[PDB]
Amino acid sequence: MADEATRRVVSEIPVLKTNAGPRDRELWVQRLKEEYQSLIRYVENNKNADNDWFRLESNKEGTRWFGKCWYIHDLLKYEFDIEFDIPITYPTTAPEIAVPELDGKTAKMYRGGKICLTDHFKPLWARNVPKFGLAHLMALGLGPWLAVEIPDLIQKGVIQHKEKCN
Ligand SMILES: [Mg+2]
Fold first, then answer.
1. 161 CA to middle of ligand 1, Å?
2. 12, 41, 43, 148: which is deepest, by most CB within 10 A?
3. Which CATH superfamily is domain 1-166 in?
4. What share of the chain is helix, strand, coil (3-state, %, to 5)?
């Protein structure tokens, strides 16, 4: 079921090619082109699916990323600031997404704000190196994490919505 579930989620996300990290100069510049193209296609797909759920940008070097994600539940829209650094051993090593404002509020987070994914994620990423990039990190990592953790925080009453939906 795991392979089909992955296929269903990632099939229209552009696959990445270049096995290069932030200290790899011209090859890193090339990897960043692939990252940006994969991300923009993923965003376009999300818009078409009425699920435009994140924005991301980086510094000039492409080593530090920041943005926002949105989560809708019972006609209320929640917004969270997100960030991550690119590991030196990327794309082998997946970046650690952080949602620092949630620090302490959930057990599925490391001290500091880095989200704690299930044990299934790292092996899935590893099997696919270097095909997965930041768009896949969002779709396979952060997305599913929000779908469990945010409803839990809502029921505990420890976060508040940004806006209502009609
Ligand atoms: Mg906020």
1. 9
2. 43
3. Ubiquitin Conjugating Enzyme (3.10.110.10)
4. 40, 20, 40
